[PDB]
Curated annotation (Swiss-Prot), chain B:
UniProt: pyridoxal 5'-phosphate binding residues: N79, G174, T175, T176, G177, T178, S240
Modified residues (N6-(pyridoxal phosphate)lysine): K49
Coiled-coil blocks: none
InterPro entries assigned: Cys_synth, Cys_Synth/Cystath_Beta-Synth, P-phosphate_BS, TrpB-like_PALP, TrpB-like_PALP_sf
Lineage, highest ranks first: Bacteria, Bacillati, Actinomycetota, Actinomycetes, Mycobacteriales
Protein name as annotated: O-phosphoserine sulfhydrylase
Record keywords, A-Z: Amino-acid biosynthesis, Cysteine biosynthesis, Pyridoxal phosphate, Transferase
Pfam family, one: PALP
């Protein structure tokens, strides 16, 4: 049991995808190629961002960067903002988010429900514009505390100390780890941990079809897949149809990459155990029509 | 690790509500009065109905009542239908849900995404259709003892294991499975434990002996409490949780006024996602 929602975080289930996996059982045709889904919607606000959000705040608190009642400022496409907003309610901080104006209405509603102030940056330039806008706001008011999810090592550390160790415990036979590439925390932290323990482990990024996050270490990745929106939608729908998991759009892209890695292993007669991140659920994407 | 999403069900967390509790810590004014929230949104389709749904299906399979490719029929306001739809997808059954009109659109969207067929306007309608089509399987959540069993065998034990000092259990009263199953378990194991319903202001599962209290809760109070929970504890709960929290706070204020220790467990049956379209948030 836990003393607050903040602690009911991580230790997420890993579920074998027996129908979607290229080959679930070993046999006469060759070795198994299995997919394993780590369900990061089993978290306080329903996404993986709860891990770095909470660790970024707590580390900021430890470093004396946050006095009680402080106002936090963060550029976000939504998930990090929501996680931070939750954490800010339990810890007594105010929150200002800079979010692109072309984000789903669900994200907006949930941030307002948590009492975050939202500044909607121009759609054009997307997250680059959000980040640049937040830097301009940080400079107009230095009392505001920007944790900076694209450069804060506590982001990466949450996956190094959490996501990675959880994966190795549940899946010591892991051959591949597949996840989306955004802040880069998930892949950098989980990947660094897994490469220290698992000999020839492959770390595979899925990214949408500039601005390089400061967290990014190019030596960590084996490969990067670019996935178009149509394939991401297709795989998201396919995951709920075949395995019952109602995931967000990034999971479709990750799945697309993982099935590619999977098809490659199968065609080469190689055993594979491919862990893939389900970073959030489908709820915040319903208004997009992608599940229609 | 798990083999299927169906297995990643239950063993939900219990979270202390330090801010909303009448008194978290023992002090000179008297003993603690604690609220503990069991997060049943941490489940395959995001609600407590995953427990009875999966158990009803698996019990119908073992009993031989349910054969490959069968059509399943169920009257539902959404949560049960969603749970069944997910499980029917995995197990290869067709699902028809009989629902009221004015169900939130998020419900219909997720039902259709899982491939469920929706028929509007619910129990009587389902019963007629089932009678007309004897090969359809109507599990019937209002009277199937696998619903209650799912809580007697899951929710109850998990709660006792995490909260052996429990004095009260509070939940919504719908099919009555949660309170009958959890409540019977708790009353058979914990001396003088109290079992408290919240209902909005008769299923064959209901047993009049189990409940020690029941509170009717108005919509405005339910909404207020739901909003209060998210503002104060960070938990984004559905509306039933508001009503449940209303009852739990009432019971907690009683214990505080009486100077008695209380450890009150309450069910968060689902999250807020499906209720955004209602404006309540
Ligand atoms: O990278 C993200 N999300 C993201 C990145 C950085 C910050 C945030 C945030 O919630 O603030 C979200 N999603 C993602 C990542 C990769 C792919 Cl392929 C797709 Cl489709 C989506
Ligand atoms: O009882 C329900 N929901 C319910 C009952 C029966 C069936 C279903 C279903 O998902 O089909 C849902 N919710 C509930 C229960 C108690 C209160 Cl006070 C409030 Cl506000 C809501
Ligand atoms: C953040 C996020 C990602 C990418 O994770 P990073 O650790 O930021 O690279 C993928 N999908 C979703 C839904 C996210 O919120
Ligand atoms: C079913 C349900 C309840 C009531 O539980 P029963 O076991 O049916 O009495 C309460 N809240 C929500 C959100 C539900 O789906």
């Amino acid at each position: 049991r836990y003393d607050s929602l903040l602690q009911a975080l991580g230790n997420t289930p890993l579920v074998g995808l027996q129908r979607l996996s290229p080959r679930w059982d070993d046999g006469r045709d060759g070795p198994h190629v299995r997919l394993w889904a780590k369900l990061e919607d089993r978290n306080p606000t329903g996404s993986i961002k709860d891990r770095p959000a909470v660790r970024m705040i707590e580390q900021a608190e430890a470093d004396g960067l946050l006095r009680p009642g402080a106002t936090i400022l963060e550029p976000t496409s939504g998930n990090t903002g929501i996680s931070l907003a939750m954490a800010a309610r339990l810890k007594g901080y105010r929150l200002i988010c800079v979010m692109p104006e072309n984000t789903s209405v669900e994200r907006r509603q949930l941030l307002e429900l948590y009492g975050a102030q939202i500044i909607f940056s121009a759609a054009e330039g997307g997250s680059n514009t959000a980040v640049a806008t937040a830097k301009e706001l940080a400079a107009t008011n230095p009392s505001w505390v920007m944790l900076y999810q694209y450069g804060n090592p506590a982001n990466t550390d949450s996956h190094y100390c959490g996501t990675g160790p959880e994966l190795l415990a549940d899946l010591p036979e892991i051959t591949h780890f597949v996840a989306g590439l955004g802040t880069t925390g998930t892949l950098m932290g989980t990947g660094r941990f897994l490469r220290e323990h698992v000999a020839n482990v492959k770390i595979v990024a899925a990214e949408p079809r500039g601005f390089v996050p400061e967290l990014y270490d190019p030596e960590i990745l084996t490969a990067r897949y670019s996935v178009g929106a149509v394939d991401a939608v297709r795989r998201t729908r396919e995951l709920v149809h075949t395995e019952g998991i109602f995931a967000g759009i990034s999971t479709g892209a990750v799945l697309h990459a993982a099935l590619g890695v999977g098809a490659g292993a199968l065609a080469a007669g190689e055993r594979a155990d491919i862990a893939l991140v389900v970073a959030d659920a489908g709820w915040k994407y319903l208004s997009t029509g992608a599940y229609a």
